Amino acid sequence: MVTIRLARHGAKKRPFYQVVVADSRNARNGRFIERVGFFNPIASEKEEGTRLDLDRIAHWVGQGATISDRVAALIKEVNKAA
Amino acid sequence: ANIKSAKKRAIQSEKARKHNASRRSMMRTFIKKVYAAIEAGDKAAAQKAFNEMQPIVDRQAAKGLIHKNKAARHKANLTAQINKLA
Amino acid sequence: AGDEVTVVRDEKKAREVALYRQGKFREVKLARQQKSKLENMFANMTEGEVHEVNIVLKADVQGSVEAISDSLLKLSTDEVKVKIIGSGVGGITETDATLAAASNAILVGFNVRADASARKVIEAESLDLRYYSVIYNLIDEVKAAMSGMLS
Amino acid sequence: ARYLGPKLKLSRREGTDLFLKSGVRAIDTKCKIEQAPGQHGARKPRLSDYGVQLREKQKVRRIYGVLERQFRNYYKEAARLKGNTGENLLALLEGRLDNVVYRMGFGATRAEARQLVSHKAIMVNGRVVNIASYQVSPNDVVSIREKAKKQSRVKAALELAEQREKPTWLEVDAGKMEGTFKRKPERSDLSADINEHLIVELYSK
Amino acid sequence: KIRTLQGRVVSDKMEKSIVVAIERFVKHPIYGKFIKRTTKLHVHDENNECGIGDVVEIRECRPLSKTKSWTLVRVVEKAV
RNA sequence: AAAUUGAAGAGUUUGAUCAUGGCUCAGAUUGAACGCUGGCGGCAGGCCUAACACAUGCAAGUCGAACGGUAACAGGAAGAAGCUUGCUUCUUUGCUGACGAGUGGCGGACGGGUGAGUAAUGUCUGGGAAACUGCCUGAUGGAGGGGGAUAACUACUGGAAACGGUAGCUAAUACCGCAUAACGUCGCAAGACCAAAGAGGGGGACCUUCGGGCCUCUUGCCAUCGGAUGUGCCCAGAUGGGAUUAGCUAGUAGGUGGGGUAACGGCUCACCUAGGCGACGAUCCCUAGCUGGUCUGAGAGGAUGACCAGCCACACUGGAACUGAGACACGGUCCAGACUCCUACGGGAGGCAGCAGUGGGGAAUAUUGCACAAUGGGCGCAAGCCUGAUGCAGCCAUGCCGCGUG
RNA sequence: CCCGCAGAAGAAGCACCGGCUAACUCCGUGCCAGCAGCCGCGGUAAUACGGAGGGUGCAAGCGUUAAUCGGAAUUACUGGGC
Ligand SMILES: [K+]
Ligand SMILES: [K+]
Ligand SMILES: [K+]
Ligand SMILES: [Mg+2]
Ligand SMILES: [Mg+2]
Ligand SMILES: [Mg+2]
Ligand SMILES: [Mg+2]
Ligand SMILES: [Mg+2]
Ligand SMILES: [Mg+2]
Ligand SMILES: [Mg+2]
Ligand SMILES: [Mg+2]
Ligand SMILES: [Mg+2]
Ligand SMILES: [Mg+2]
Ligand SMILES: [Mg+2]
Ligand SMILES: [Mg+2]
Ligand SMILES: [Mg+2]
Ligand SMILES: [Mg+2]
Ligand SMILES: [Mg+2]
Ligand SMILES: [Mg+2]
Ligand SMILES: [Mg+2]
Ligand SMILES: [Mg+2]
Ligand SMILES: [Mg+2]
Ligand SMILES: [Mg+2]
Ligand SMILES: [Mg+2]
Ligand SMILES: [Mg+2]
Ligand SMILES: [Mg+2]
Ligand SMILES: [Mg+2]
Ligand SMILES: [Mg+2]
Ligand SMILES: [Mg+2]
Ligand SMILES: [Mg+2]
Ligand SMILES: [Mg+2]
Ligand SMILES: [Mg+2]
Ligand SMILES: [Mg+2]
Ligand SMILES: [Mg+2]
Ligand SMILES: [Mg+2]
Ligand SMILES: [Mg+2]
Ligand SMILES: [Mg+2]
Ligand SMILES: [Mg+2]
Ligand SMILES: [Mg+2]
Ligand SMILES: [Mg+2]
Ligand SMILES: [Mg+2]
Ligand SMILES: [Mg+2]
Ligand SMILES: [Mg+2]
Ligand SMILES: [Mg+2]
Ligand SMILES: [Mg+2]
Ligand SMILES: [Mg+2]
């Protein structure tokens, strides 16, 4: 199936997760259909902590995709913020 | 092999194999009989063979042993031949 | 063989200690060899009747190498000399194969075997591999080998 | 690494003062500047074009206390930027923290300023920065810690910097022992003794 | 709407099949001199209506036969 | 606004000169090696050679909410027995929690490794029609009633072992009928035909043998049309050297009819035609995994494919097929070969180019480490289990980069 | 990542110096021993061999070798000739 999962980027002790729509059968950093946004658990308070394109999330879920736990909590938090 | 699952899988695959062998054997027996009737030229016998064969392919395709398209092709070609006869 | 074994505290210093020990040993051994060679080259200008036999030796354990080499070197005579080119512990490998093939020598395996890499060079080369498992028979055959050269 | 050796020998080779001393005594009272170092320093040989370009480059590099690779990186960055490369690289070199803090008058020599910096004695914008090669931005504020505010060498520095010429793009308050770097200079505010063309043609081979 | 290519007959010997040359005219990569290249294709035709020397129109189709993946559409001009 | 601003020569043939012409040097860069020397830190990188051979440890499991069940540990129950009368051995009970082995379900076709082979069976780009697809999702409905086996187990019984053979032996979402059948299949129509499986949670009243019935909820199963995803098939162009390699081809090129495949097709056979490709380079020989890119260069260009990412192929060598939604399958099966090992010589076992590691080759390249805390993956309702992927650590001036030795 | 302690205290080598090409003098040998990328040094006046003093360039690195491009318009389409 297609799902939205977190892909790790950046450097040691410096994580940067892309939010990715991809087949579950590929690797963590493997092929994917579309990049949707990003999250950074290290960034300082003067910089944006996260960004997601909610419309595409809705579109793909309607198509039939599934959401992981961390991504789901992320959408929950952003919806709380806005 | 080395892993438990490999051994168990081989053991059950053997069973699946002999069962499939038997069912496919019945399948070919029936198509052979209907083909022989078709070459014979007796329309009544051909129709009778077609009607005894017809449920069998559908049942075996239902269980997945042969995909639906193969059964459909067989039935359509055989009825085309029987109409060639008459 | 026989060297003292000690546990050491730290990691980095051991490598330097071992390499420093190796450098001086290499220096000294080369020093003796080239001292002898430089001193005696022109003394070797004269010649005489000498029967030399060259052997290359592979043995299973360190002490076995020592013993076999010691026996062969003590067996040397003023006119009959058994000059071992070089010996080491382990299997008969391509270094030994091409070494014995290069010089007029023989590969002797004492409780050790050959390997495919040396095997190919040997079959192409027609080098002689002599196999023995008892010290006595080895001494007997090598004694025959050197004694056959005379006259 | 740095150049830790004798200092006046650099000036003698280059043939002109490099301000590598405090200034309590005139440079001539310390060394025979006109003669080059070495036993054959009396002679004046011919210097070819490549020689003079190399001497100019070496003069700049020694005056700002920069090693070779760092200077190469500076030149590359200046080439990448817009405008006349000489102007840009001159701005780049003057953008170092050591040159600025010396130029603000908090030290006797660039070496002394660097030794102060490396020992966490300064803040920019209230943030302690010990890295010498840090590059400063306009409107940044530089100050000394109160902990090292008591240093007598800093005190005497505040005085001996007075007899020097003071810059135009900088503002300094001895009352609060701090400074503001209003804006970056162009080529004009610096010495005409620096010929940038030779450096440009040298590296651009 | 259908993509269609136009070409020259060169072989009507094959049964219910013809051979057509498509001439294309393109520049050279580095030299820039304009060359004239040709592609030969096998086309299916069902009444053998074509003749050598004609110029016809053909289009893509399923693999009706091995090495026969294009179909005749309309005969543009006749030989002779 | 922005996203480019780019171009140096010198030495050397002669008594001396101009020219032509070869040679040598100054610059960048590397998966580098060796010599001398050696403080710290941050990020990266580390068998290019024998696709040579491998000791040892680990690298693929999970579900008692599918099932017959107690192999172990625990709790309860009779009170066995004891017994200090309210404390402790064995006396048991699938009774409960759980769970060794077994059937059954899903997963080992992904993740990882390597570049031996291939001049196209590949790849890159742009188009296309005759196709299927588990887990995910939309809709419409369906879910009645039976039958005979088997593992486990029990009692025997061969072999050195691997591994067996016989008899009794029980259940299920295992297996197989029958009913029912349209929007599905075939058919011009008329007509003809096709499916299945339950489990768990809680409960008032009523039945009630308390076996549970009965109500409700969740989750499973069957059919058909859709979506999303993956994969299969075809076309045009592009993709090394050698013309001291000029002709190649008979299922070969077409056509008719059968057969086969999920699908079109000489994919396969019978017959008929005598064709097809080639100087716009066929056939043949040598070499080679490709690409997004990397280095160099003012540019056009030249060389190259280490690391990251997409595609292809391979798993001791050669050949074949089953199971399966999907393989002609690294840690699956069968046959042949070589090689290594065990033996009662009667016969057997093996496959690191997975992570460490050893031998060997070489100028040359590391630890037989910690943890599933995070990302991601398989199984489950979930708790949870597994993961040498991955996170982190150890060695190495291999490189870029910052600092000090006042 | 921060604070305290003591002490200049625990820490600099490599290559080159005749022209190309930045930087010279003496001693030791005497076409020998040797150097070398090229022209070429050495037969008792060696800035070119060895040692020393001085100097030049890099720097926790410095050199030699291997290899690709540039210099090469020396395959010349941009850009060569008979
Ligand atoms: K087996
Ligand atoms: K049933
Ligand atoms: K020091
Ligand atoms: Mg992959
Ligand atoms: Mg099944
Ligand atoms: Mg550095
Ligand atoms: Mg065009
Ligand atoms: Mg620190
Ligand atoms: Mg149970
Ligand atoms: Mg019990
Ligand atoms: Mg269990
Ligand atoms: Mg497998
Ligand atoms: Mg390899
Ligand atoms: Mg396409
Ligand atoms: Mg039975
Ligand atoms: Mg029963
Ligand atoms: Mg079933
Ligand atoms: Mg009807
Ligand atoms: Mg039925
Ligand atoms: Mg290529
Ligand atoms: Mg034929
Ligand atoms: Mg046909
Ligand atoms: Mg290859
Ligand atoms: Mg550039
Ligand atoms: Mg290019
Ligand atoms: Mg590769
Ligand atoms: Mg192998
Ligand atoms: Mg095979
Ligand atoms: Mg199958
Ligand atoms: Mg395969
Ligand atoms: Mg394996
Ligand atoms: Mg075997
Ligand atoms: Mg390995
Ligand atoms: Mg070696
Ligand atoms: Mg997880
Ligand atoms: Mg495990
Ligand atoms: Mg380091
Ligand atoms: Mg000079
Ligand atoms: Mg020298
Ligand atoms: Mg001359
Ligand atoms: Mg002299
Ligand atoms: Mg000298
Ligand atoms: Mg000196
Ligand atoms: Mg050029
Ligand atoms: Mg060129
Ligand atoms: Mg010319």
UniProtKB/Swiss-Prot annotation, chain A:
Pfam families assigned to the protein according to its UniProt record, in alphabetical order: Ribosomal_S16
GO CC field: cytoplasm; cytosolic small ribosomal subunit; small ribosomal subunit
Induction section of the entry: Part of the rpsP-rimM-trmD-rplS operon.
Gene Ontology BP, a term: cytoplasmic translation
GO molecular function: DNA endonuclease activity; four-way junction DNA binding; structural constituent of ribosome
Record-stated family: Belongs to the bacterial ribosomal protein bS16 family.
Subunit composition and interactions: Part of the 30S ribosomal subunit.
Name this protein carries in UniProt: Small ribosomal subunit protein bS16
Species assigned in the record: Escherichia coli (strain K12)
Swiss-Prot record, chain B:
GO terms of biological process kind: cytoplasmic translation; ribosomal small subunit assembly
Listed GO CC annotations: cytoplasm; cytosol; cytosolic small ribosomal subunit; small ribosomal subunit
InterPro entries, sorted: Ribosomal_bS20, Ribosomal_bS20_sf
Protein name per its UniProtKB record: Small ribosomal subunit protein bS20
Domain of life, source organism: Bacteria
Taxonomic lineage from the root: Bacteria, Pseudomonadati, Pseudomonadota, Gammaproteobacteria, Enterobacterales
GO molecular function, one term: small ribosomal subunit rRNA binding
Keyword Ribonucleoprotein listed: yes
Subunit architecture: Part of the 30S ribosomal subunit.
Gene3D superfamilies, A to Z: Ribosomal protein S20
Functional note: Binds directly to 16S ribosomal RNA.
UniProt keyword list: Ribonucleoprotein, Ribosomal protein, RNA-binding, rRNA-binding
Annotated signal peptide: none
Ranges for region Disordered: 1-25
From Swiss-Prot, chain C:
Disulfide bonds: none
Subcellular location: Cytoplasm
Highest taxon in the source lineage: Bacteria
Family the entry assigns: Belongs to the TRAFAC class translation factor GTPase superfamily. Classic translation factor GTPase family. IF-2 subfamily.
Protein task: One of the essential components for the initiation of protein synthesis. Protects formylmethionyl-tRNA from spontaneous hydrolysis and promotes its binding to the 30S ribosomal subunits. Also involved in the hydrolysis of GTP during the formation of the 70S ribosomal complex.
Protein name, UniProt field: Translation initiation factor IF-2
Curated annotation (Swiss-Prot), chain E:
UniProt-recorded Gene Ontology molecular function terms: rRNA binding; small ribosomal subunit rRNA binding; structural constituent of ribosome; zinc ion binding
The keyword Disulfide bond belongs to this UniProt entry's keyword annotation: no
GO cellular component: cytoplasm; cytosolic small ribosomal subunit
Keyword field contains Methyltransferase: no
Domain of life: Bacteria
Keywords attached to this entry: Antibiotic resistance, Ribonucleoprotein, Ribosomal protein, RNA-binding, rRNA-binding
Record GO biological process: cytoplasmic translation; response to antibiotic; ribosomal small subunit assembly
InterPro entries: NA-bd_OB-fold, Ribosomal_uS17, Ribosomal_uS17_bact/chlr, Ribosomal_uS17_CS
Pfam families: Ribosomal_S17
Family statement drawn from the similarity comment of this UniProt entry: Belongs to the universal ribosomal protein uS17 family.
Alphabetical list of HAMAP family matching this protein: Ribosomal_uS17_B
Task performed by this protein: One of the primary rRNA binding proteins, it binds specifically to the 5'-end of 16S ribosomal RNA. Also plays a role in translational accuracy; neamine-resistant ribosomes show reduced neamine-induced misreading in vitro.
Note, other: The strain missing both S17 and L29 grows very slowly and has a rather unstable temperature-sensitive phenotype.
Assembly and binders: Part of the 30S ribosomal subunit.
Protein name per UniProt: Small ribosomal subunit protein uS17
